[PDB]
Ligand binder design. Structure first.
Ligand SMILES: CCOC(=O)[C@H](C)N(C(=O)c1cccs1)c1c(C)cccc1Cl
Length: 226
């Protein structure tokens, strides 16, 4: 891929992201003043773990579907064999969802957009896993400090997804190639926007992976229990 071919990769990634981002950034920013009251928060805390688990499962189900659609629009993701597509989505989809959260997150008051309004982690008290919820918020807090642009989120989420170290791939070398192409594409774009300094600030890959595994473990405790 030459100059025009790396810039085309950039833009196709930004395209998929734009067409699949679920919630527009301007809407999310405009809504930051729209915050759950004390009665509404208490209304959420009083709900059973089961109903709360139900609303979160639906939220996480809807968010994951847009991520699946993001994948399917990625130049070269289709060219991968169907088996490998599945291995990537299985291991990465929820990780991308975790990253995507930072846009719906207000570091000013440590709140997140949920079901029409902004609220803190104490919204989710009834689930009984604040340590995990607080990790997710902290993760989103430290990402929100980098002020990711829409494009950087596009490229970075592509790279969360396209990872050749996912256990059980069949065409591992072809997944490696695409990954290498996106890495360069991302690095180039950062150089054109004078944003290279974020690279040293990007979390250790094992942070996401570790947080997500902990998230899936609780999710499986939930799925079996209800
Ligand atoms: C493991 C069970 O706990 C959750 O489902 C929690 C409530 N939760 C999440 O797990 C999320 C994980 C990734 C994006 S949201 C979440 C939701 C659904 C909306 C807003 C903020 C968060 Cl942190």
């Amino acid at each position: 891929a030459s100059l025009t071919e790396i810039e085309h990769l950039v833009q196709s990634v930004c395209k998929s992201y734009r067409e699949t981002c679920q919630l527009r950034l301007e809407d999310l920013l405009r809504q930051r003043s729209n915050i759950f009251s004390r009665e509404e928060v208490t209304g959420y805390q009083r709900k059973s773990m089961w109903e709360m688990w139900e609303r979160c499962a639906h939220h996480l189900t809807e968010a994951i579907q847009y991520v699946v659609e993001f994948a399917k629009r990625l130049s070269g993701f289709m060219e991968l064999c169907q088996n490998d597509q599945i291995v990537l989505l299985k291991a990465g989809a929820m990780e991308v969802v975790l990253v995507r959260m930072c846009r719906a997150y207000n570091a000013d008051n440590r709140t997140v957009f949920f079901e029409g309004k902004y609220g803190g982690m104490e919204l989710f008290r009834a689930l009984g896993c604040s340590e995990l919820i607080s990790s997710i918020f902290d993760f989103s807090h430290s990402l929100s400090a980098l002020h990711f642009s829409e494009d950087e989120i596009a490229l970075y989420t592509a790279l969360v997804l396209i990872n050749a170290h996912r256990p059980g791939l069949q065409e591992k070398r072809k997944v490696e190639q695409l990954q290498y192409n996106l890495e360069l594409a991302f690095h180039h774009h950062l150089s054109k926007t004078h944003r290279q300094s974020i690279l040293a600030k990007l979390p250790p890959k094992g942070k996401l992976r570790s947080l997500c595994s902990q998230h899936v473990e609780r999710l499986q405790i939930f799925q079996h229990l209800h």
